[PDB]
């Protein structure tokens, strides 16, 4: 009959949009936040109405995507109604290191709690320290002032990742934090044992990643 919700919208979609959780979630999602398993409320909500949300957001020319690890996020198309941006290479270095830290069974005994110093120590253990220092300053040659500047840039970028939902600080101590599964997106270039060039091409074609 006329004047009936079904004329304009599916009942389940209207039911979802009327929920008290939606505005928060919407706001966040648009801002680029990733949603993992720990924030139950949100995650559960997402799960319950997945297809309706996907269909909804489609209107905007944006894909609501679900990674295999169980985390949701937004990927805009070329014709997107919502702006799209890219992360910095330092963010990538910290991202891939946070990923290796999550996997490491050697540190699993910490129960997920890591310290900025441990992250920094792992990073310098693997990457080329003196060549990476070039991004901090063109004249960097291992001076302590420059080493402290690097540490502060790391602290800063880490704080940005926290806002993206990739890491959670402790309630009372800011020198310590916990990881989430959303970090696995930094491994998108190697999860399949194939030619790196072809993988990279595939990713840029899918809109996952841009070059610099």
């Amino acid at each position: 009959s006329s004047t009936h919700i079904e004329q304009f919208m599916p009942v389940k979609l209207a039911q979802a949009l009327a929920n008290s959780l939606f505005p928060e979630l919407d706001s966040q999602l648009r801002a680029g936040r990733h949603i993992g398993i720990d924030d139950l409320d949100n995650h559960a909500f997402l799960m319950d109405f997945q297809e309706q949300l996907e269909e909804f957001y489609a209107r905007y020319n944006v894909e609501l995507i679900r990674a295999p690890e169980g985390f949701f996020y937004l990927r805009p198309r070329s014709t997107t109604l919502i702006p799209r941006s890219v992360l910095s290479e330092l963010d990538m270095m910290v991202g891939k290191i946070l990923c290796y830290l999550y996997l490491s069974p050697e540190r699993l005994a910490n129960q997920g709690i890591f310290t900025s110093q441990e992250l920094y120590e792992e990073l310098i253990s693997l990457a080329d320290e003196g060549k990476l220092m070039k991004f901090v300053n063109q004249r960097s040659s291992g001076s302590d002032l420059d080493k402290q500047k690097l540490q502060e840039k790391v602290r800063t970028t880490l704080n940005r990742l926290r806002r993206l939902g990739m890491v959670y600080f402790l309630p009372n101590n800011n020198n310590k934090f916990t990881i989430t599964e959303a970090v696995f997106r930094f491994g998108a270039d190697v999860r399949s044992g194939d030619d790196p060039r072809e993988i990279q091409l595939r990713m840029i074609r899918d809109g996952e990643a841009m070059p610099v």
């Binding site: 680029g32 937004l74 805009p76 799209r84 890219v86 990538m92 891939k96 990643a209 070059p211």
Partner: protein, 49 residues
Amino acid sequence: RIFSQRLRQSVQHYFDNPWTLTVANAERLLDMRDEELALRNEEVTGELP
């Protein structure tokens, strides 16, 4: 022994093919800058009932 090689070599050689992820970055809501609050002062007077 599957990912150790797989991921370490990626970090070690990243700069040969630097790549970056994409994220939704919706615009912030522009608002008026709050000017210093200016109240109305007039020293009103009148006959008392």
